[PDB]
Amino acid sequence: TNQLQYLLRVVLKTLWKHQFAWPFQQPVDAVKLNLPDYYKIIKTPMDMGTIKKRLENNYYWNAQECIQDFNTMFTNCYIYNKPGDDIVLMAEALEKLFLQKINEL
Amino acid sequence: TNQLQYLLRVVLKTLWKHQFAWPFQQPVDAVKLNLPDYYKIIKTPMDMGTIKKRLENNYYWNAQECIQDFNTMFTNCYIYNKPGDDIVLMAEALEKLFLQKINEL
Ligand SMILES: CCS(=O)(=O)Nc1ccc(OCCOCCOCCOCCOc2ccc(NS(=O)(=O)CC)cc2-c2cn(C)c(=O)c3ccccc23)c(-c2cn(C)c(=O)c3ccccc23)c1
Numbered sequence: 536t537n538q539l540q541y542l543l544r545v546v547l548k549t550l551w552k553h554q555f556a557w558p559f560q561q562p563v564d565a566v567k568l569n570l571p572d573y574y575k576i577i578k579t580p581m582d583m584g585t586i587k588k589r590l591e592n593n594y595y596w597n598a599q600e601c602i603q604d605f606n607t608m609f610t611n612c613y614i615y616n617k618p619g620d621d622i623v624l625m626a627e628a629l630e631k632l633f634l635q636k637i638n639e640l
Numbered sequence: 641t642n643q644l645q646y647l648l649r650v651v652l653k654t655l656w657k658h659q660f661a662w663p664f665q666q667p668v669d670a671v672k673l674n675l676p677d678y679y680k681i682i683k684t685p686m687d688m689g690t691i692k693k694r695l696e697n698n699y700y701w702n703a704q705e706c707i708q709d710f711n712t713m714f715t716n717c718y719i720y721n722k723p724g725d726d727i728v729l730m731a732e733a734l735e736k737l738f739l740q741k742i743n744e745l
């Protein structure tokens with residue numbers, strides 16, 4: 536079974552319908568959210584809308600490159616936000632689901 | 641001074657750049673937010689993205705029709721949510737600003 540295909544049809548598909556997914560479906564808009572230094576602190580922004588476009592448009596060399604984009608999404612969230620913030624609890628729940636889907640591949 | 645023009649160039653513009661505006665810039669997406677009764681309770685959904693489109697596309701008969709869309713946006717929020725919810729504090733702050741700009745015509 537092709538792993539990029541699985542990341543698109545299973546992993547992304549599963550994360551996207553999760554009740555905590557909506558803050559991660561598009562780039563963090565630091566201007567609208569009034570987030571100071573977000574772009575100073577987060578040098579490589581990432582989100583599942585960008586990942587979806589990259590899967591649909593042949594961007595990735597391999598599955599590991601797409602997995603590291605998911606991980607960049609999670610770690611950006613942990614780096615910027617304080618532990619126990621709602622957004623961090625949401626990211627952690629999605630990351631657990633992501634790991635479950637990746638471990639079944 | 642034409643009131644619809646003022647609603648577009650001053651009132652909407654001022655609310656839109658407010659730090660609490662981003663939840664109101666597009667329709668409430670009840671499936672993504674997991675609000676499984678929103679459309680049963682809210683029969684006339686409204687948001688500032690819809691208002692912007694209506695102002696830009698000649699929808700309104702007059703300024704009172706547009707002001708009632710703003711008011712529908714606020715009252716939808718008060719009807720659906722708990723008093724003291726974050727979204728309600730945000731709507732109330734925007735509504736104060738809206739009233740300030742409307743009172744200054
Ligand atoms: C410009 C937004 S974005 O493009 O950047 N996306 C986005 C959104 C939230 C994000 O954080 C989520 C937590 O934020 C804290 C700010 O307090 C939240 C207070 O709000 C309550 C939710 O209210 C809405 C939000 C969006 C949307 N719209 S919608 O289309 O229906 C949604 C499906 C609608 C509502 C909403 C509107 N009404 C009128 C309602 O009656 C209502 C009733 C119940 C539930 C929701 C609503 C982030 C984000 C992502 N990451 C990775 C970060 O590290 C991060 C770090 C700091 C702050 C934010 C983030 C990104």
Ligand SMILES: [Cl-]
Pocket residue numbers: 547548551587
């Ligand atoms: Cl999807």
Ligand SMILES: [Cl-]
Pocket residue numbers: 628
């Ligand atoms: Cl969960």
Ligand SMILES: [Cl-]
Pocket residue numbers: 652653656692
């Ligand atoms: Cl605008």
Ligand SMILES: [Cl-]
Pocket residue numbers: 733
């Ligand atoms: Cl304020």
